[PDB]
C-alpha cells in the first residue's frame, strides 16, 4: 500500500489530461475523506527494473543444487505415511456417515451443515494430494540417484 502525491494550489483543474493514464485507480474513500483531489493529487507509481535487478530478484528463492537430490530419512517417511493413512481411516468413516445424509437435509440446511463440523470430503482431497505428491517425489529422487551415482 503506497502512493505518491503533490500539492494543489488555491486557484479550474490542477492538471491537464491527454490520456487515460491518470484515471485508472479509483481513489479510496479514506484518502478522499482526508483531502485527496482537494488539496493534493496522486501520481502513478512505476516499479521499472533493469536486467540485473530482474536476474537477482528471481535468484533469491533458489535453493542450492544438493537440496534437489536429497532424500528424506526413510523412517520419517514411513512414519508420516502411516500417520496420514491412520487419519484417512476415520475420515472415510465420517465420509460414509455424511453421504448417507444430503438426501434427508433441506437444500438450505446443507449450507449450514458445514459450520463448526469437520467435512470429510475436503480433508480427504487434501490428504490424498499430500500423500501422492510426497511419495511420487521421493520415489523419483530415489530412482534418479540410483542411476546417477554409478
Amino acid at each position: 500500500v503506497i502512493d505518491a502525491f503533490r500539492l494543489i494550489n488555491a486557484n479550474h483543474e490542477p492538471r491537464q489530461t491527454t490520456s487515460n493514464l491518470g484515471h485508472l485507480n479509483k481513489p479510496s474513500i479514506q484518502a478522499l475523506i482526508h483531502g485527496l483531489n482537494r488539496h493534493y493529487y496522486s501520481i502513478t507509481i512505476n516499479y521499472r527494473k533493469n536486467e540485473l535487478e530482474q536476474k537477482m530478484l528471481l535468484n533469491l528463492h533458489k535453493k542450492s543444487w544438493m537440496e534437489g537430490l536429497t532424500l528424506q530419512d526413510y523412517s520419517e517417511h514411513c512414519k508420516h505415511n502411516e500417520s496420514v493413512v491412520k487419519e484417512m481411516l476415520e475420515l472415510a468413516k465420517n465420509y460414509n456417515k455424511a453421504v448417507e445424509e444430503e438426501d434427508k437435509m433441506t437444500p438450505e440446511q446443507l449450507a449450514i451443515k458445514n459450520v463448526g463440523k469437520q467435512d470429510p470430503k475436503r480433508h480427504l482431497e487434501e490428504h490424498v494430494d499430500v500423500l501422492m505428491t510426497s511419495n511420487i517425489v521421493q520415489c523419483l529422487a530415489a530412482m534418479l540417484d540410483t542411476v546417477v551415482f554409478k
Partner: protein, 152 residues
Amino acid sequence: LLKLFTTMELMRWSTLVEDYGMELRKGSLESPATDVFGSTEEGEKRWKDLKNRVVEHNIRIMAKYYTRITMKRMAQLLDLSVDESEAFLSNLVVNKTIFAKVDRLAGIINFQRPKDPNNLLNDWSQKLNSLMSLVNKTTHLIAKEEMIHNLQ
C-alpha cells in the same frame, strides 16, 4: 600400562604379567610398590579384577572389527578354554556391555546387528550426501589453485 590400556590392539596377559608382573605385585625398591596388588586377600581379588579388565578390553577390541569370529579362535586369542570364554561372553551380553550372538550350533560369534532395509537405505543416503559435499569441496580447492597459478 596406561598407554597399553588406551591403545587399540589386542594385548596378551602373558606379556603384561611377564613385564609388569614384578613391578606391580612384588614392588620395587627404587619404585615403591602399592597395596593395590599385595599378598592380602583383597590383593588376589584385585589381581583377578585386572585379569578381567584385560579380557574385557580384548573382547571389545575384537568387537569393533571382527564381524564374525569362530568360538575356538576367540577362546584361543583370549587365552581361555572354550567354556570359560563362552561364559564370559554370555555374561557380558546379559549385562548389556556388548552385542553379539553366539551360534553355539555352528561355533560362530556374530558381532553384527540386524540390517533393516530402512537403515540400509539411510546409510546409502548418508553416503550420497557425503559424496555431494566432497564434490563441492574439491571444486572450491580447484578454484583456489587455478586462481593462484593461472593469473600468471
